[PDB]
Amino acid sequence: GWVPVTKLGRLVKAGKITTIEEIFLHSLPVKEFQIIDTLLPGLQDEVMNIKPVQKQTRAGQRTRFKAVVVVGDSNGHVGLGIKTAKEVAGAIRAGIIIAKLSVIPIRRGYWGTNLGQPHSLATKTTGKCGSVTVRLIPAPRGSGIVASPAVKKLLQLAGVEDVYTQSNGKTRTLENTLKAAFVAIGNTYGFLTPNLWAEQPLPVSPLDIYSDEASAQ
Amino acid sequence: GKGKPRGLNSARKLRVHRRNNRWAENNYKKRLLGTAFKSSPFGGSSHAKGIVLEKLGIESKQPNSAIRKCVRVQLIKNGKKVTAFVPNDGCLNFVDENDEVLLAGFGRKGKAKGDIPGVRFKVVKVSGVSLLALWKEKKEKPRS
Amino acid sequence: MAKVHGSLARAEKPKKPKGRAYKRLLYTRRFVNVTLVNGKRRMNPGPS
Amino acid sequence: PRAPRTYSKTYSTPKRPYESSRLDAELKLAGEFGLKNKKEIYRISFQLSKIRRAARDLLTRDEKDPKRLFEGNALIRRLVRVGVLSEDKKKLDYVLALKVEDFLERRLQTQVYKLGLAKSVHHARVLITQRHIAVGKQIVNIPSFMVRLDSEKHIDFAPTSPFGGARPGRVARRNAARKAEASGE
RNA sequence: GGCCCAUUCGGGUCUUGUAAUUGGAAUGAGUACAAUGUAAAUACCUUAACGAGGAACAAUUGGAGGGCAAGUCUGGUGCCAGCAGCCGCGGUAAUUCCAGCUCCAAUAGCGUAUAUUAAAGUUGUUGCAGUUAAAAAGCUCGUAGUUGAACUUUGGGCCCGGUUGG
């Protein structure tokens, strides 16, 4: 079964929130992985790298297993998490849950003119973690994704059809590469382009419109 | 300010520093000084023919250990001598001598911590007949 | 050892078919049937 | 001396040789259409990737720019005349999303099987090679003809082939010369 | 298997799988009367008669721990062991040597060697490196070379005539 124990969770169990964007507009914190599953039922994962790793406790070499799992839609939502664990099949299923917990949108724009759907990125963006830099660049139609295979597979599940990459730094520790392409996506909502210049009034939260509901006993 | 000049009439310092310390790229210095003639045993060629002095047996000392069979030779265009390598008659049964042979190089660089020791060449044919045509036995060595 | 000079053409295993027909054969043997080892995948396997 | 004779190379291999997600989509085109090797599929990606480059920069210069209007409306006009662009997609941005089987569906090996002459896609390439099919009046024997659009409707058999015409081959003639004379003895 | 008649059969539609299970059709590699070609010829285009179950009218080079697509397979007393660009695999029976079988890649091999280009933001104008990793001269005056603050006619009014959203 599912008992919500967080007061966002009661609001979505009763069905007062129908899309995920109300979590994103008022930027609400999320701490229960079942909220995403009912909200985004089409979510879908792959595992990137599984590596045994070692700790010399009591000079007894106990084996852990680190896993890198990316979950993601094929519309504009991604996720990524990492978990070490004692057994192999626990580290995969524990690795999925953190990745379900960290979902972000992505602004998807055009290259040039305005015919039909958006395919590429809106602007150029960049994130750096560790020592790696990764920079993403808009492309025309027919381009496809030009990246390394571990980064091309990420951007399929966010559903960008054409994009140009360019990466500096030591790109051969893939736990750090993917943690830079992640930052370089999630900044796309955050560059104030000129069409976002206009004014709008502030909406009000669901966490007090439905305040009598989703309250503890 | 980056430690290099930026202004507009500055093209002469910029192009005369660049060829100044372009002499630390390791194989641009080999090409302009032209050390391929003055030091290399081949002079700048793919293959080269020599005439075999004698059989040699060489061994590989640390972690590896086995019986590597090589051959002395003396080049016709040059007179200098080198030690080639013959591939995997590991049966120890193809000594041959006062013969005409064709060398080549390895795609060379290696690891001799197992001490697969300091030769640089190989053998692709002997007395007008390929090596693999004898090992796969498609010809046999021409004589009367 | 060598070739036989008499090959004039004026006046253990069965073969494989060579050319465009071989591309037809490979299309079947991995895309019209299946081979698994309990969902996990070791196609073209060792016989065990 | 004399003048020299121009030539060009017509395909190009790819950068990474052994990676598996490429190798299968090439395979499923070679079984779908029956192509001999993967040099035939590189041949269609080269020709495409110069079309795409040619439109990729006429888009950069302005509209109402007389090089865009003369070299654009000719490139568009040639792709429709063979029948790859759709007749409602006559705009220059629409060629930038063209695909590689939109040329593969216009060969003679593919347009004779769809038009009801051969029971399979491998009964096409052996019907063409043996001089049986003749668009217009001309026996062609090339499985990569790329038929123009207003001559889809002229394909038939040949006025020399035993299928759509005259005398049987030298099996049936040889079989009739093996039985009809042997009826008496 | 398969869609369905399914009662349950088979009622249809399929797809293979194989059955040294069986049948008939197509054709040019090759040969060769003629004609055409050509300065004369040879060959390519055209064409009498001839020309296959094709088992023989028989595709080949390189690999099957990793990078990098492909094997848990049997045989050596280590017949015929360093060992495959670089991490390495051998000390019997090897998940790499030597061979048999089955698979993979390109199909006319890019197989090996030597130069050069991309990869290389490891030559850096675009565009690198400052303490501890290669790397700021013992210290101030001073050639050539490079680089050098702000300011001197703005604004106002009328009127014709362009192609674009219209």
From Swiss-Prot, chain A:
Physiological role: Component of the ribosome, a large ribonucleoprotein complex responsible for the synthesis of proteins in the cell. The small ribosomal subunit (SSU) binds messenger RNAs (mRNAs) and translates the encoded message by selecting cognate aminoacyl-transfer RNA (tRNA) molecules. The large subunit (LSU) contains the ribosomal catalytic site termed the peptidyl transferase center (PTC), which catalyzes the formation of peptide bonds, thereby polymerizing the amino acids delivered by tRNAs into a polypeptide chain.
Lineage: Eukaryota, Fungi, Dikarya, Ascomycota, Saccharomycotina
Name by which UniProt lists this protein: Small ribosomal subunit protein uS5
Entry-linked NCBIfam families: uS5_euk_arch (TIGR01020)
Keyword annotations from UniProtKB, A to Z: Acetylation, Cytoplasm, Isopeptide bond, Methylation, Nucleus, Ribonucleoprotein, Ribosomal protein, Ribosome biogenesis, rRNA processing, Ubl conjugation
Coiled coil residues, start to end: none
Mod. after translation: N-terminally acetylated by acetyltransferase NatA.
Record organism: Saccharomyces cerevisiae (strain ATCC 204508 / S288c)
Family to which the UniProt record says this protein belongs: Belongs to the universal ribosomal protein uS5 family.
Biological-process GO terms, alphabetical: cytoplasmic translation; positive regulation of translational fidelity; ribosomal subunit export from nucleus; rRNA processing; translation
Gene3D superfamilies cross-referenced by the UniProt entry: 3.30.160.20, 3.30.230.10
Localization in the cell: Cytoplasm; Nucleus, Nucleolus
Principal subcellular localization: cytoplasm
Record has Acetylation as a keyword: yes
Pfam families noted in UniProt: Ribosomal_S5, Ribosomal_S5_C
From Swiss-Prot, chain B:
Protein name as it appears in the record: Small ribosomal subunit protein uS12A
Cell membrane listed as a keyword: no
Quaternary data: Component of the small ribosomal subunit (SSU). Mature yeast ribosomes consist of a small (40S) and a large (60S) subunit. The 40S small subunit contains 1 molecule of ribosomal RNA (18S rRNA) and 33 different proteins (encoded by 57 genes). The large 60S subunit contains 3 rRNA molecules (25S, 5.8S and 5S rRNA) and 46 different proteins (encoded by 81 genes).
Naturally occurring in which organism (per UniProt): Saccharomyces cerevisiae (strain ATCC 204508 / S288c)
Keywords: Cytoplasm, Hydroxylation, Isopeptide bond, Ribonucleoprotein, Ribosomal protein, Ubl conjugation
Miscellaneous notes: Present with 10600 molecules/cell in log phase SD medium.
A GO term from the CC aspect: ribosome
GO molecular function: structural constituent of ribosome
Xref: Gene3D superfamilies: Nucleic acid-binding proteins (2.40.50.140)
Membrane-spanning ranges: none
Subcellular location(s) of the protein: Cytoplasm
Family named by the database record: Belongs to the universal ribosomal protein uS12 family.
Swiss-Prot record, chain C:
One BP annotation, GO: cytoplasmic translation
Protein origin, superkingdom: Eukaryota
Keyword Ribonucleoprotein set for record: yes
Annotated segments matching region Disordered: 1-22
Annotated compartments: Cytoplasm
InterPro entries for this protein: Ribosomal_eS30
Cellular component GO terms held in the UniProt record: cytoplasmic stress granule; cytosol; cytosolic small ribosomal subunit
Main location per the UniProt record: cytoplasm
Keywords, sorted A to Z: Cytoplasm, Phosphoprotein, Ribonucleoprotein, Ribosomal protein
UniProt keyword Disulfide bond present: no
MF GO annotations: structural constituent of ribosome
Modified residues (Phosphothreonine): T35
Function: Component of the ribosome, a large ribonucleoprotein complex responsible for the synthesis of proteins in the cell. The small ribosomal subunit (SSU) binds messenger RNAs (mRNAs) and translates the encoded message by selecting cognate aminoacyl-transfer RNA (tRNA) molecules. The large subunit (LSU) contains the ribosomal catalytic site termed the peptidyl transferase center (PTC), which catalyzes the formation of peptide bonds, thereby polymerizing the amino acids delivered by tRNAs into a polypeptide chain.
UniProt miscellaneous comment: Present with 37600 molecules/cell in log phase SD medium.
Quaternary structure (record): Component of the small ribosomal subunit (SSU). Mature yeast ribosomes consist of a small (40S) and a large (60S) subunit. The 40S small subunit contains 1 molecule of ribosomal RNA (18S rRNA) and 33 different proteins (encoded by 57 genes). The large 60S subunit contains 3 rRNA molecules (25S, 5.8S and 5S rRNA) and 46 different proteins (encoded by 81 genes).
Family: Belongs to the eukaryotic ribosomal protein eS30 family.
Swiss-Prot record, chain D:
Main subcellular location of this protein, as a coarse class: cytoplasm
Compartments it resides in: Cytoplasm; Nucleus, Nucleolus
InterPro entries per UniProt: Ribosomal_uS4, Ribosomal_uS4_CS, Ribosomal_uS4_euk/arc, Ribosomal_uS4_N, S4_RNA-bd, S4_RNA-bd_sf
GO cellular component terms listed in the entry, alphabetical order: 90S preribosome; cytoplasm; cytosol; cytosolic small ribosomal subunit; nucleolus; nucleoplasm; small-subunit processome
Superkingdom, taxonomy of origin: Eukaryota
GO biological-process terms attached to the record: maturation of SSU-rRNA from tricistronic rRNA transcript (SSU-rRNA, 5.8S rRNA, LSU-rRNA); ribosomal small subunit biogenesis; translation
Keywords of the record: Cytoplasm, Isopeptide bond, Nucleus, Phosphoprotein, Ribonucleoprotein, Ribosomal protein, Ribosome biogenesis, RNA-binding, rRNA processing, rRNA-binding, Ubl conjugation
Molecular function via GO: rRNA binding; structural constituent of ribosome
Record-linked SMART domains: Ribosomal_S4, S4
Role of this protein: Component of the ribosome, a large ribonucleoprotein complex responsible for the synthesis of proteins in the cell. The small ribosomal subunit (SSU) binds messenger RNAs (mRNAs) and translates the encoded message by selecting cognate aminoacyl-transfer RNA (tRNA) molecules. The large subunit (LSU) contains the ribosomal catalytic site termed the peptidyl transferase center (PTC), which catalyzes the formation of peptide bonds, thereby polymerizing the amino acids delivered by tRNAs into a polypeptide chain.
Miscellaneous comment: Present with 106000 molecules/cell in log phase SD medium. There are 2 genes for uS4 in yeast.
Gene for this chain: RPS9A
